[PDB]
Amino acid sequence: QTELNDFLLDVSKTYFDNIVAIDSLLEHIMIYAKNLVNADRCALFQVDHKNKELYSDLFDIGEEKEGKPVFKKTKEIRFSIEKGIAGQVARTGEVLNIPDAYADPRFNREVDLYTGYTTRNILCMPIVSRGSVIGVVQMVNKISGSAFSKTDENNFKMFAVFCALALHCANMYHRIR
Amino acid sequence: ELNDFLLDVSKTYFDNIVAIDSLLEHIMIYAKNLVNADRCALFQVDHKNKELYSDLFDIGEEKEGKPVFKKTKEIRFSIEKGIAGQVARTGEVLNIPDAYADPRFNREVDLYTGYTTRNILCMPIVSRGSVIGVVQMVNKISGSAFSKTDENNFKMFAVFCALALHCANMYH
Ligand SMILES: Nc1ncnc2c1ncn2[C@@H]1O[C@@H]2COP(=O)(O)O[C@H]2[C@H]1O
Ligand SMILES: Nc1ncnc2c1ncn2[C@@H]1O[C@@H]2COP(=O)(O)O[C@H]2[C@H]1O
């Protein structure tokens, strides 16, 4: 498959070109994941450990630059770590596939209520560093599907491990110069 | 378990040799589970002697909870031999559905270990245009052979083998 080939080429280009590949890798990971699972949107939240909140970092608003997504850089979406599918994953490190967001009692509707967007489906995974969840990535809304499929979910679990290993490798490289 | 595994993968070690070894183990254990292989191995290339030699070699053992690997350079053979040697020599990925039917397969390792190999997924580990190793997944557990999906998923994690091995090669 062309897209995977293309992504593996993008990951090595990334390590070849960058001092600290992490950000480029995470963005490439999210963009590749989005297209693979056919999600309408995605996000990266950071965990504010100090305050026990999540806040937005990258927030896809469906805006595209020449075929591939651009994300909005904004910290404005901020809420308690006790709320939402994002909160659940920030607290436990689980990778979740929620087929019906509004049916799930953990879902935090406050974001939809604010944006006017309607969230139907969520794949949610942690970003992990040094034994802690430091961040959360979501894919939102299966395009013309009723939910993210079991294949989707398994591919996303694989991306969670990919990211845990990428962060570990980055922490490890940083130690040698 | 996936959440424990992710948090455990992220756990660091101050000691550099322990760190690099633990990382490689994690990669192999996850790859093995991901494609449902019975066994796996990492070989390094000895460019001088034109040989491959084992670095990490699964023998199906367990010390606690999860797979544990033999750290042993004991398996060694000419780069002319085997599916591993073919990948070292050309850099191509191989998915071999029936090892004994492939004339490139090195049957001498099975004679030595007593194990019977049936199928092999084998990927090159490349650092700077140079194949510095090969990784293998061996013997699909609930299937006839490794699928193309298996191959693609296994390939995604190969970069982490290259990074880990480069690190050991910097820490001479
Ligand atoms: N890119 C996005 N656009 C609109 N809403 C989003 C986006 N990413 C995440 N969200 C929503 O943010 C919510 C945070 O709480 P939940 O994880 O329960 O549910 C999440 C989704 O409803
Ligand atoms: N973990 C393992 N246990 C037993 N045999 C293995 C293992 N990993 C690789 N091999 C064998 O090692 C061989 C080396 O040459 P081949 O690549 O032709 O075929 C390989 C397999 O038969």
Swiss-Prot record, chain B:
It is found in: Cytoplasm, Cytosol. Abundant in the putamen and caudate nucleus regions of brain and testis, moderately expressed in the thyroid gland, pituitary gland, thalamus and cerebellum. Residues 19-165 form the GAF domain. 3',5'-cyclic AMP binds at R39, C40, I83, A84, T117, Q136. Belongs to the cyclic nucleotide phosphodiesterase family. Plays a role in signal transduction by regulating the intracellular concentration of cyclic nucleotides. Can hydrolyze both cAMP and cGMP, but has higher affinity for cAMP and is more efficient with cAMP as substrate. May play a critical role in regulating cAMP and cGMP levels in the striatum, a region of the brain that contributes to the control of movement and cognition. The tandem GAF domains bind cAMP, and regulate enzyme activity. The binding of cAMP stimulates enzyme activity. It is linked to Dyskinesia, limb and orofacial, infantile-onset: An autosomal recessive, early-onset hyperkinetic movement disorder characterized by axial hypotonia, dyskinesia of the limbs and trunk, orofacial dyskinesia, drooling, and dysarthria. The severity of the hyperkinesis is variable. Homodimer. This is cAMP and cAMP-inhibited cGMP 3',5'-cyclic phosphodiesterase 10A. The gene is PDE10A.
